[PDB]
Design a protein around this ligand. Structure first.
Ligand SMILES: Nc1ncnc2c1ncn2[C@@H]1O[C@H](COP(=O)(O)OP(=O)(O)OP(O)(O)=S)[C@@H](O)[C@H]1O
Ligand SMILES: Nc1ncnc2c1ncn2[C@@H]1O[C@H](COP(=O)(O)OP(=O)(O)OP(O)(O)=S)[C@@H](O)[C@H]1O
Ligand SMILES: Nc1ncnc2c1ncn2[C@@H]1O[C@H](COP(=O)(O)OP(=O)(O)O)[C@@H](O)[C@H]1O
Ligand SMILES: [Mg+2]
Ligand SMILES: [Mg+2]
Lengths: 348, 240, 329, 336, 256
């Protein structure tokens, strides 16, 4: 499972031995560690490896962290409330929670942390730099990244930025330049199969053979988090007894997207467009991002065998176009619906 | 089972009105000696340590932990007070005229840090009102107050944008008024810097005591001492 | 220690009087006739950046009152606050009183009025004409679409034509007399072409070129010095790149572009501008060649304005030029 | 201060301290160095690619001009971290510009040439609003005798036309392996990095127009080599494995898949590729290099593939999905 | 070098409170005679001119004529940070740099050394107070403040008319109109309440009320304000100090 079964060090990560060796090489000399930016697919263990690196450079007491609340004030009297995951050796921030106020929190909080120093009793003040983790750095606005551009170079002896992100493209070139770029490839089917096997031997799950683990690995597309979360759900659905004939439990939103793809392929009509608009509204209202919605819809429309090469080419072209549009817009549906319309124009 | 009594609510209201602004969740230890409160801020810059003597009725069978919010505490205290709690104190009762106020306890990851009396290169004491006025006057210029203790002279400077302030004071002792006295003991010329927003909040504790002690060391945090005892461990800026 | 020589050449050679403002002869003559005859209507100077608007208005304020103009003239620039409350109180009070220093018509200089809110302009629309026999208004602008039509109609419109070549040669000669220096004719022509009407860039790059000679009293500023100081591509390398792209094949054209842009550290944004400026003179025997040649190159320029890549956009420019130059054959 | 610099990473450790340390732009450093003996310094506008020396050369110039004593009291520095707005530009920038220059001490007046003006450096002025830059116009023109303005940016287009006109422009050239290999050799010699014969060329080629990225890459490679303790040199593939460069064999497999294959095969291979963590920008750049450099294709294909790669890069530079864009680009290049 | 040590502390405070919300940037010109300064309004309508000799200072030493410009808001910020029991000492170095204000207590050693960074103002010193005023008068400051802030409630403009041995303040507005007519008279048992007037030609001219409401704020310094009026000339509102004088030159409104 994702919880209670997780490597809390570098000698425990049982996949991507090359990345573990590189992280050990980086952790060899802690006081000379530059800023790091981890990129790769989702559910790859980037945060786990980052916490393992932190535990490797600092003491083993970095995992006992606590959530604190911070109040900030914008230009107006609008008060904003954020949370910080602080440990005796570092602090974690997810600036994505603010809509368009990432610059304020970034600048004020980072300057406040960089000016003062860390404390003792973990010999009165002497300690090394305090790490600041930035989770989901892609959602940072361009102005927030601009404000962050100078904070790294100005105060480097106190603040080291370890930023986790996926699909590194929405990161400005200066920020891409001023930190190391580390990649985390998804684990192969064999290593993730061993990860699932260790879980099912520790949790005492009743399986017939190892084929089900390989099926789970092939269905999770490489996301270790999804793999563990689906293995647990499948164990719960079959009463801790895994069989060779077990339905792969697809999350609800993927099932809705598949139904929408079937509806698109079958009926290419304006009323069908209104119904798909209703489904898209109902999906977006339950906090599902439009980018991943478009991605899954495109990769499901490309999977139906009823369309030939030309339809798939036009679909992927319209998908790239409308994804670029979505990356430059605020009203999400206004683009998604449009994309669907173009698909309806492509098939017939 | 803990049960303590104050003859007047003023002694407990002024202290909380003093230290309610910086910290919000503080852990209190109750034992035979007195109440020992400890808290660390969110950014780990200022550690607050409060010591309340039992002479200010007291009854505690064993030393216990507790945690209570100061916002609602000042809200209800806007007449003697009695604070009581039973075994496994999931609720603390405050009896005030007869009244009862039950407050719930919050779980705090309060790692008990030791309070040791190390050696300090400089230790001085100056009236609270004068220090609060100096801080409130220097904070208008800059946002970083530098304290420099050299050759039997104390110096509070602040280099701002519109100009620069520099208050130089010498130790003075008076007989006709014992409250206006400035004592100093120095072993090494020191010069540190601190944030003005922290001192702007600390100076509100001027109603707690008539004098304030400033203890400064080379690599150790600054100590702001109010005699109920209350000590602030403030962290400086490294250097530039 | 602050002397007159402690100013950059942009401000060191600011025209003191109207006689030292070149180029805008048609406007300056009529302005001098205005001040001589005694009727100075509400003026609206509209011009590109670096043409002489502010210098002309300060020279006029000096010639009207005297060597102490800031004493009685009120100057509101973009640095000050120009809200509706400002127009209500400050400008309206200055317009409705007499002078403290002299006895004459007051002058309100509203510099960069295009940065004013529509509400402030609407409020000023009435105060500009309610007090006319006592004060006059000068509105300086670079964009004439920010000003409301009402405010724009109440002022005599004077457009500051970009500095023609003759005026810039005159000013360069004046500077080279006031500064021990020598300038080659071809280098002067290159500077004229690089100016693009801007009178400030001329003086800026002239000082920068005087700084890179190691002796400014004997060595003359050659065309190479001017082209190197700003990093602009010389016409020779530009023509060579264009010829290699048009005639030679893909590999050698890419190699030539890379070797030219890496010999002096050029930029694609300047190569594109030079290429379009030299290509707009060709006699294309159709209308669809120019369409693609402009569309693709403008798209590449817009993409460069975001700093995407540096090696993909060069091949993009090469392919765009080649595909455009295919309808001719 | 030497121990703090030694502990600092190589980026800050080897930051240029004088105007002779920046061995990148001999066209813009000489103009500033000759300003020392002179007194006329124009409003500077340093613009160029990320990581070329602007923020370092301005600090080096201010130091060499004023000295570490007068440096704190003679220059104001407004970076993107500070709150730069119309109100701030109107109040604080004008207040500091409309100020009297600080009195230079005898030490500074004797050692360093103290000019009779302060310096306001607005770093990363491409993040300012248009109204702020508009208000800056007369602020940077009236108090020109006691204050100068240095703007720094990556996009000269983002700065309004009046500010670009008034400021003296300085384009910072990109740093390739021809005019920047000396600095990397100096770093490798000062840090005992046992490099290969031509690995620094590959390092500077990977970081296209960037020296800070190359320095960080060299530091990380030296650390990864010293971790094992083997003592052998650092080869080129050892560097480009961690630099994000995709191995040449995988690129050849991609070219073989796109040269012949239907939509489904390319889609499956792109899914398998994106399973691994590869920056789509690097893959597009390597594809462009391999295709344009090659001579086995005709010009009618080269023009179309160049335009396609340009379109894909322009799409990727807007923070879009790398998987979808890469799949679309591969399908498009396959359609040819 | 320049050392100006005052006799008291609140003297400079009361002197600066005259132009609290009246003007922003001032430039004190310090010579051997004393401190002379002038400041033009933000709308360039009224000009404040203050002169304080070596009479108000406890100690005065000025080697060469210096000129120190400063913003009034920062000056008031610095002045409010000093207790009214210490002494105020203006200290300036050889070259004009940030002016040094010094607060020294007379019983306990409390040295408050504030530095105020000077502003670089285009000090275009003119030559005023050298023009002949066709009408002059002098009246108690309390009565003038009463008249001004009573007529300011009925309109925004106030017309002052000096006729043959009569002063007239007229306020014409929307809700109504007011007119105060005073006559010159000199009392012997109370010489401070006397109203003096010397007129050569009849005068009629208007002013704004928003500026008179700020001019009357200077009535906290003296008790007898003088008013000099002339056609085609600024109005001189002078308050006489024990050492110098504080005078406002107000520009009259233009009538149609
Ligand atoms: N017609 C001109 N004759 C001579 N010098 C000129 C002329 N126009 C500009 N200059 C020079 O350029 C400098 C700046 O010109 P300005 O008139 O201040 O620019 P501007 O008209 O205000 O345009 P803006 O306001 O920046 S858009 C002057 O100080 C001169 O040195
Ligand atoms: N010209 C140069 N000479 C020597 N080292 C350089 C040079 N340019 C960059 N570096 C190195 O790269 C580091 C960063 O340089 P910067 O000056 O911050 O780059 P940059 O131009 O500021 O990039 P930005 O700010 O993101 S546009 C320096 O500390 C040096 O170690
Ligand atoms: N080497 C490993 N062994 C076992 N589990 C792992 C390993 N690496 C990652 N995981 C599991 O993956 C889960 C989610 O990883 P996460 O940090 O969310 O990845 P990402 O940072 O890419 O989102 C964790 O709960 C962890 O249990
Ligand atoms: Mg102008
Ligand atoms: Mg920089």
């Amino acid at each position: 499972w994702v919880d209670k079964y997780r490597p809390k060090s570098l000698n425990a990560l049982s996949h991507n031995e090359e990345l573990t060796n590189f992280l050990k090489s980086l952790s060899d000399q802690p006081r000379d560690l530059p800023h790091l930016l981890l990129y790769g697919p989702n559910g790859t263990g980037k945060k786990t490896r980052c916490m393992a690196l932190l535990e490797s450079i600092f003491g083993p007491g970095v995992y006992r962290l606590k959530i604190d609340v911070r109040q900030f004030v914008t230009a107006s009297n609008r008060k904003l409330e954020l949370n910080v995951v602080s440990s005796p050796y570092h602090l974690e921030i997810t600036p994505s929670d603010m809509g368009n106020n990432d610059r304020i929190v970034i600048q004020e909080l980072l300057k406040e942390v960089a000016q003062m120093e860390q404390v003792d009793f973990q010999d009165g003040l002497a300690h090394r730099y305090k790490c600041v983790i930035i989770n989901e750095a892609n959602s940072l606005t361009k102005d927030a990244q601009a404000a962050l551009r100078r904070t790294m170079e100005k105060y480097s002896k106190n603040i080291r930025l370890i930023m986790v992100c996926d699909s590194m493209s929405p990161i400005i070139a200066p920020i891409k330049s001023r930190c190391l770029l580390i990649r985390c490839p998804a684990p192969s089917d064999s290593e993730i199969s061993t990860i699932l096997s260790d879980v099912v031997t520790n949790e005492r799950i009743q399986l017939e053979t190892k084929d089900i683990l390989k099926r789970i690995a092939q269905a999770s597309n490489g996301n270790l988090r999804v793999s563990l979360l689906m293995l647990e759900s499948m164990a719960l659905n079959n009463e801790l007894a895994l069989k060779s004939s077990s339905p792969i439990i697809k999350p609800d939103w993927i099932i809705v997207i598949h139904k929408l793809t079937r509806k698109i392929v079958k009926e290419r009509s304006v009323n069908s467009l209104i119904e798909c608009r209703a489904v898209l509204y109902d999906l977006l209202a339950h906090c599902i991002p439009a980018n991943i919605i478009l991605k899954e819809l495109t990769f499901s429309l490309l999977d139906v065998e009823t369309l030939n090469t030309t339809n798939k080419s036009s679909i992927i072209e319209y998908s790239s176009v409308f994804d670029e549009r979505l990356s430059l817009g605020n009203k999400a549906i206004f683009h998604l619906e449009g994309f669907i319309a173009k698909v309806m124009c492509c098939l017939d | 089972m803990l049960e303590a009594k104050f003859e007047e609510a003023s002694l407990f209201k002024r202290i909380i009105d003093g230290f309610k602004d910086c910290v919000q969740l503080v852990n209190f230890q109750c034992k035979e000696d007195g109440i020992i409160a400890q808290a660390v801020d969110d950014s780990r810059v200022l550690l607050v340590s409060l010591e309340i003597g039992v002479e200010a009725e007291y009854r505690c069978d064993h030393p216990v932990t507790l945690g209570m919010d100061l916002t609602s505490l000042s809200k209800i205290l806007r007449d003697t007070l009695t604070l009581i709690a039973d075994n496994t104190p999931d609720s603390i009762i405050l009896l005030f005229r007869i009244a009862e106020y039950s407050l719930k306890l919050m779980d705090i990851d309060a790692d008990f840090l030791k309070i040791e009396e190390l050696q300090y290169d400089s230790t001085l004491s100056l009236p609270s009102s004068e220090f609060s006025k100096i801080v409130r006057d220097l904070s208008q210029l800059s946002d970083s107050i530098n304290i420099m203790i050299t050759k039997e002279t104390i110096k509070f400077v602040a280099d701002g944008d519109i100009g620069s302030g520099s208050v130089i004071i010498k130790p003075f002792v008076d007989m006709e008024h014992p409250e206006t006295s400035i004592k100093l003991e120095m072993d090494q010329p020191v010069d540190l810097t601190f944030g003005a927003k922290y001192l702007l909040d600390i100076i509100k504790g001027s109603s707690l005591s008539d004098r304030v002690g400033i203890r400064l060391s080379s690599e150790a945090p600054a100590l702001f001492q109010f005699d109920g005892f209350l000590q602030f461990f403030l962290a400086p800026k490294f250097n530039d | 220690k602050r002397s007159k020589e402690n100013l950059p050449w942009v401000e060191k050679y600011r025209p003191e009087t109207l006689d030292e403002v070149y180029g805008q002869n048609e406007v300056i003559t009529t302005v001098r006739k205005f001040v001589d005859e005694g009727k100075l209507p509400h003026l609206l100077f509209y011009g590109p950046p670096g043409t002489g608007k502010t210098s002309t208005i300060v020279a006029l304020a000096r010639e009207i009152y005297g060597k102490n103009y800031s004493n009685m003239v009120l100057e509101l620039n973009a640095s000050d606050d120009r809200g509706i409350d400002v127009v209500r109180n400050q400008i309206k009070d200055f317009a409705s009183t007499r002078q403290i220093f002299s006895k004459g018509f007051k002058l309100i200089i509203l510099d960069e009025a295009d940065a004013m809110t529509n509400a402030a302009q609407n409020a000023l629309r009435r105060v500009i004409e309610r007090y006319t026999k006592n004060t006059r208004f000068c509105v300086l602008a670079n964009y004439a679409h920010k000003l409301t039509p009402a405010l724009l109609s109440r002022c005599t419109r004077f457009r500051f034509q970009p500095l023609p070549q003759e005026a810039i040669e005159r000013r360069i000669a004046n500077v080279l007399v006031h500064e021990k220096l020598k300038l080659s004719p071809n280098a002067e022509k290159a500077l004229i072409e690089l100016s693009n009407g801007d009178m400030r860039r001329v003086l800026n790059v002239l000082q920068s070129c005087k700084a890179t000679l190691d002796n400014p009293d004997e060595d003359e500023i050659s065309d190479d010095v001017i082209y190197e100081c700003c990093g602009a591509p010389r016409p020779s390398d530009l023509k060579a790149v264009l010829k290699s792209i048009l005639e030679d094949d893909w590999g050698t054209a890419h190699y030539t572009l890379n070797k030219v842009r890496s010999a002096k550290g050029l930029a694609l944004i300047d190569l594109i501008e030079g290429i379009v400026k030299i290509l707009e003179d060709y006699e294309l025997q159709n209308e669809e060649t120019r369409v693609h040649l402009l569309t693709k190159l403008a798209d590449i320029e817009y993409s460069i304005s975001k700093g995407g890549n540096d090696q993909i956009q060069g091949s993009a420019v090469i392919g765009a030029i080649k595909a455009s130059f295919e309808n001719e054959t | 201060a030497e121990q703090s610099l030694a502990q600092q990473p190589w980026v800050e450790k080897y930051r240029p301290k004088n105007l002779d340390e920046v061995t990148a732009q001999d066209h813009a450093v000489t103009v500033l160095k000759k300003t020392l003996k002179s007194a006329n310094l124009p409003h500077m506008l340093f613009y160029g690619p990320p990581g070329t020396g602007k923020t370092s050369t301005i600090l080096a110039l201010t130091k060499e001009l004023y000295g570490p004593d007068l440096m704190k009291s003679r220059i104001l520095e407004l970076n993107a971290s500070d709150e730069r707005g119309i109100s701030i530009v109107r109040e604080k920038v004008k207040n500091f510009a409309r100020l009297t220059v600080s009195k230079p001490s005898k030490h500074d007046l004797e050692n360093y040439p103290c000019p009779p003006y302060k310096i306001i450096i607005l770093d990363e002025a491409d993040s300012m609003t248009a109204d702020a830059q508009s208000a800056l116009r007369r602020t940077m023109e009236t108090y020109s005798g006691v204050t100068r303005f240095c703007l720094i940016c990556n996009y000269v287009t983002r700065i309004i036309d009046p500010l670009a006109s008034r400021c003296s422009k300085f384009r910072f050239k990109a740093l390739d392996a021809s005019n920047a290999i000396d600095r990397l050799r100096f770093i490798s010699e000062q840090e005992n990095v046992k490099c290969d014969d031509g690995v620094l060329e590959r390092i500077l080629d990977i970081s296209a127009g960037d020296l800070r990225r190359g320095i960080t890459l060299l530091q990380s490679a030296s650390k990864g080599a010293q971790y094992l303790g083997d003592g052998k040199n650092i080869t080129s593939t050892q560097v480009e494995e961690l630099a994000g460069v995709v191995p040449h064999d995988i690129l050849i497999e991609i070219v073989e898949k796109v040269k012949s294959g239907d939509f489904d095969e390319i889609k499956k291979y792109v899914n398998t590729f994106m399973k691994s963590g590869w920056s789509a920008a690097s893959v597009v750049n390597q594809l462009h290099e391999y295709y344009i450099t090659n001579d086995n294709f005709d010009t009618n294909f080269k023009n179309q593939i160049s335009w396609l790669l340009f379109t894909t890069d322009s799409r990727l530079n807007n923070g879009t999905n790398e998987h979808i864009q890469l799949l679309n680009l591969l399908v498009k290049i396959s359609q040819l």
